[PDB]
DNA sequence: GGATTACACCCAAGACACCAGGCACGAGACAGAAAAAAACAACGAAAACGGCCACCACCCAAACACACCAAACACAAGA
């Protein structure tokens, strides 16, 4: 939940996500990129 | 090859990504691969020349005998 990775406020209008949130976003991007290889051309040096 | 190295408290100071090559789409060229034909192997049909049996005659093989030579028990010699 967001409690484990809360955001914060820089100057009254700004927020950066916690490290875990950006890490989870990167994991999601990696997952979707994986689901973009077994659906089309993939010369075995991109799947790995 | 990692992993740990006093405890509490105070203050100040700076940053809170910018910018550059990859995915998609965006089009050519030999290579990844597919289609064809002509000189590659064989077989059917004709021609005549090489192969088989005669005919054939002169040259090599066997018998007879010659003289000649190699050879083998033993009467004699010998230590």
CA of A27 to C1' of B3 (A): 29
Annotate A29-44 with b (16+ C-beta within 10 A) or e (fewer). Answer: eeeeeeeeeeeeeeee
Using a 7 Å CB cutoff, list residues 8-37 of A near strand B: 10-11, 14, 16, 36
| Alpha helix segments (H runs only) across A1-48 | 19-34
Contact A47, A37 (CB under 8 A): yes
Q: How far is CA A48 from CA A24, A27, A34, A44, A45, in A?
A: 20, 15, 9, 7, 6
| Rounded Cα–Cα distance for residues A2 and A8 (Å) | 12
């Amino acid at each position: 939940p967001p409690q484990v990775r809360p955001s914060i406020a820089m100057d009254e209008t700004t927020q950066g996500q916690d490290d875990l949130t950006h890490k989870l976003s990167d994991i999601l991007k990696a997952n979707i990129n994986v689901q973009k290889l077994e659906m089309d051309g993939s010369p075995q040096h991109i799947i790995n």
